[PDB]
Write a protein that binds this ligand. Structure first.
Ligand SMILES: [Cl-]
Ligand SMILES: [Cl-]
Ligand code: NA
Length: 129
């Protein structure tokens, strides 16, 4: 599923991401935009052989099991394919664990390079939330 901007904001808001660990909704929409272009089916392979999955590009090195990342962890206790669903619940619940682990949203390279310190509120402007 390829989300609309406001559609995804409302979905994320419903799942408790607005101001989660102090990160306003615009941060999450901005990260999703640049990680996946709002596409729940996005996958990308990393150089160490791990793979990033879904709308927030969550990494099989630590967070999910794809059966092909030897020596990795599965800290969200889910198959990585569950992160590709049109229902964002699994991605959001795993993202809550990631952002709580000490490093905040800096775990998302695109958020660090393209959203952090920008006016992220513009990503939810005009949306009915
Ligand atoms: Cl915001
Ligand atoms: Cl933080
Ligand atoms: Na893994």
């Amino acid at each position: 599923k390829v989300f609309g901007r406001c559609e995804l904001a409302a979905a994320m808001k419903r799942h408790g991401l607005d101001n989660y660990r102090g990160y306003s909704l615009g941060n999450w929409v901005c990260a999703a935009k640049f990680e996946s272009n709002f596409n729940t089916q996005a996958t990308n392979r990393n150089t160490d052989g791990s793979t990033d999955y879904g709308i927030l590009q969550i990494n099989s090195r630590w967070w999910c099991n794809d059966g092909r990342t030897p020596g990795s962890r599965n800290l969200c206790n889910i198959p990585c394919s569950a992160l590709l669903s049109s229902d964002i619940t699994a991605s959001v619940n795993c993202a809550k664990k990631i952002v709580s682990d000490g490093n905040g949203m800096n775990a998302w390279v695109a958020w660090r390079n393209r959203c952090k310190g920008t006016d992220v509120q513009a990503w939810i402007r005009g949306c009915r939330l």
